[PDB]
Amino acid sequence: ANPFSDVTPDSWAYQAVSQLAQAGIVNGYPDGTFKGQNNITRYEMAQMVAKAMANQDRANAEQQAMINRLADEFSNELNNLGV
Amino acid sequence: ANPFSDVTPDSWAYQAVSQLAQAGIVNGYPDGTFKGQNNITRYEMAQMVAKAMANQDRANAEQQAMINRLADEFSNELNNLGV
Amino acid sequence: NPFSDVTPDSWAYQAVSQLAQAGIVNGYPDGTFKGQNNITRYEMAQMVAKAMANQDRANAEQQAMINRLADEFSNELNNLGV
């Protein structure tokens, strides 16, 4: 539940956002976010998910499915952000 | 407007925050932000505006007027941020 | 304003400095603690919130530092959902 606990590189959600960054759908994230094996806070993840949701129409159907699932997973932080 | 939708370089607000960065009033933003002509999210723009409203003592009369206009234009995200 | 500054003179800046050195605070921008630059209350609060998320790493006085930071940045932490 804690918004500044971590999401780890071995998790589905980390790998999802990292792959959406590979795709250019996630862009504009703080430099070094995907560097090495550093965790990402749920709050930072949610910002990346919110931006992907705004760039949603450019995703393939599989990526749209990833965004949909991420949006559920981070709904509490997304609501905090006004999304 | 979604808080993580994009503000484009043609918008008054984009150009104003870029000018405030050149002047030093907006500082401490992500590197990359004003290099070239890439979009900035409303949420990041709002963080830059909040910073300038904190730094508004540095501003000349015309810059203070710009900042006031910006705080209006991003009032929704500024309210989310607690500004 | 959550984006008003915290200076390097401040107890709070130095405490998060110390906790980052201790490894309790991580994942902050690279230029955060260098060049004697101020930190916004917003970025301070994010680091404090990681310190709370990791508070089981801290000893008694580091916990006391975390507790004091959590009070100091309570408004920003609330806005962040913490």
Residue numbers in the entry:
A (entry chain B), B (entry chain A): 23 to 105
C (entry chain C): 24 to 105
In the authors' words:
Most diderm phyla from the Terrabacteria group have recently been shown to lack well-characterised OM attachment systems, but instead have OmpM, which could represent an ancestral tethering system in bacteria. OmpM consists of an N-terminal periplasmic S-layer homology (SLH) domain connected via a linker region to a C-terminal OM β-barrel. Here we use single particle cryo-EM, X-ray crystallography, molecular dynamics simulations, bioinformatic analyses and functional assays to show that OmpM1 from V. parvula (VpOmpM1) is a general porin with similar structural and functional properties to E. coli OmpF, with an additional mobile periplasmic region that can bind V. parvula PG and take on different folds.
Surprisingly, the crystallized stalk does not fold into a coiled-coil but forms a compact trimer composed mainly of α-helices (residues 23–105). The residues that form the coiled-coil in the extended AlphaFold2 prediction instead form helical hairpins and extensive intra-protomer interactions rather than interact with the other chains in the asymmetric unit. The protomer interfaces form grooves on one side of the trimer that could potentially accommodate ligands. However, mapping of the previously identified putative PG-binding residues onto the stalk crystal structure shows they are spread across the structure, suggesting that this conformation does not bind PG. The protomer fold of the stalk observed in the crystal structures aligns well with an alternative, compact conformation predicted by AlphaFold2. However, the trimerization interface in the compact stalk prediction is different: residues that are far away in the crystal structure (e.g., M75) interact in the predicted compact conformation. We considered that this compact state could be an unstable high energy conformation (hence the low prediction confidence), and that the stalk construct is stabilized in a similar conformation in the crystallization condition. Notably, the soluble SLH domain did not bind to V. parvula or E. coli sacculi, unlike the full-length VpOmpM1. This suggests that the structure of the isolated SLH domain is different than in the full-length protein, as observed by cryo-EM. Therefore, we do not believe that the conformation observed in the crystal structure is the result of crystal packing.
